C-alpha cells in the first residue's frame, strides 16, 4: 500500500523517498541514518542523503481517508499521525 512506511508500518508522516525508491516517514529515515549511515533500512542500498520529500505521495494523501485501526474513526491520511497521537484506543494498545 502506497501510504505506509517501510520502517514503522504506520501511515506515512511527511513521506520521503530515497534514491532507491523506498518511501518512509521523514523522522523514520532520519533516525535510521543516524544509526546506520548511508544505507537504506529496507533494501540496504547506498544512500548519499535522506532522499527527497515525496510530494506526489503527500498530495495523494490529502484525498484519501481510512479508518483508524484502533478506534475505527475515518481519518484523512494526511492527518493520521495527528489522529493516533491522541487516539486513546491507540494509546491503550501501544503505550504512550
Ligand atoms: Cl468518522
Ligand atoms: Zn515511519
Ligand atoms: Zn531502499
Ligand atoms: Zn483512532
Numbering used by the authors: 33 to 128
Give passages from the manuscript.
RNF125 is a small protein (25 kD) that contains, in addition to the RING domain, three zinc fingers (ZnFs) and a ubiquitin interacting motif (UIM). Using mutational analysis, activity based assays, NMR and X-ray crystallography, we have demonstrated the essential role of a C2HC ZnF for the interaction of RNF125 with the E2, which originates from the requirement of the C2HC ZnF for the structural stability of the RING domain.
The C2HC ZnF adopts a ββα fold, typical for ZnF domains, which is capped on both sides by α-helices formed by regions Li1 and Li2120-128. The α-helix of Li2120-128 is almost continuous with that of the C2HC ZnF, but is kinked at C119. Interestingly, the structure demonstrates that extensive intramolecular interactions take place between the RING domain and the C2HC ZnF. Specifically, electrostatic interactions can be observed between C57 coordinating the proximal Zn2+ of the RING domain and R113 in the C2HC ZnF, where R113 makes additional hydrophobic contacts with H45 in the RING domain. Furthermore, a hydrophobic patch is formed between V43 in the RING, and L109/M112 in the C2HC ZnF.
